[PDB]
Amino acid sequence: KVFGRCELAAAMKRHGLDNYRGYSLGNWVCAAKFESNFNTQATNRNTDGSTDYGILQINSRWWCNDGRTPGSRNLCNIPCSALLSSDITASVNCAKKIVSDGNGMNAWVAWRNRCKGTDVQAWIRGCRL
Ligand SMILES: [Cl-]
Ligand SMILES: [Cl-]
Ligand code: NA
Ligand code: NA
């Protein structure tokens, strides 16, 4: 599924991400835009052999099992394919674990390079929330 900007904001808000660990909703929408272009089915292979999955491009070396990343840890206890569903529940619950591990949203390279320090509130402007 490819989400609309406001559609995704509403879904993320209902799942408890607005101001989760101090990150306003606009940060999560900005990160999803540049990680996946709002597409739940997005996948990308990394140089080390791991793969990033879903709307928030969660990596298989640490967070999910895809059966082909040797030595990986599967800390969200989920198959990586569950992160590609049109239902974002699994991706949100795993993202909550990631953002609480110490480094905040700096774990998402696209957030650091393209959202951090910008007017992220613009990503929810005009939406009925
Ligand atoms: Cl915001
Ligand atoms: Cl980047
Ligand atoms: Na929309
Ligand atoms: Na893994």
UniProtKB/Swiss-Prot annotation:
Q: Does the keyword Repressor apply?
A: no
Q: Which UniProt keywords apply?
A: Allergen, Antimicrobial, Bacteriolytic enzyme, Disulfide bond, Glycosidase, Hydrolase, Secreted, Signal
Q: In which tissues is it expressed?
A: In the egg white and polymorphonuclear leukocytes.
Membrane-crossing segments per the record: none
| A GO BP entry | cell wall macromolecule catabolic process
| Active site per the UniProt annotation | 35, 52
Q: Which domain of life is it from?
A: Eukaryota
Query: In the UniProt record, which is one GO cellular component term?
Result: cytoplasm
The record's subcellular locations are: Secreted
Its function, per the record, reads: Lysozymes have primarily a bacteriolytic function; those in tissues and body fluids are associated with the monocyte-macrophage system and enhance the activity of immunoagents. Has bacteriolytic activity against M.luteus.
**In its UniProt entry, what is this protein called?**
Lysozyme C
Give the organism, scientific name.
Gallus gallus
Q: Which lineage do the record's taxonomy fields give for this organism? A: Eukaryota, Metazoa, Chordata, Craniata, Vertebrata
Q: What is the name of the gene encoding this protein?
A: LYZ
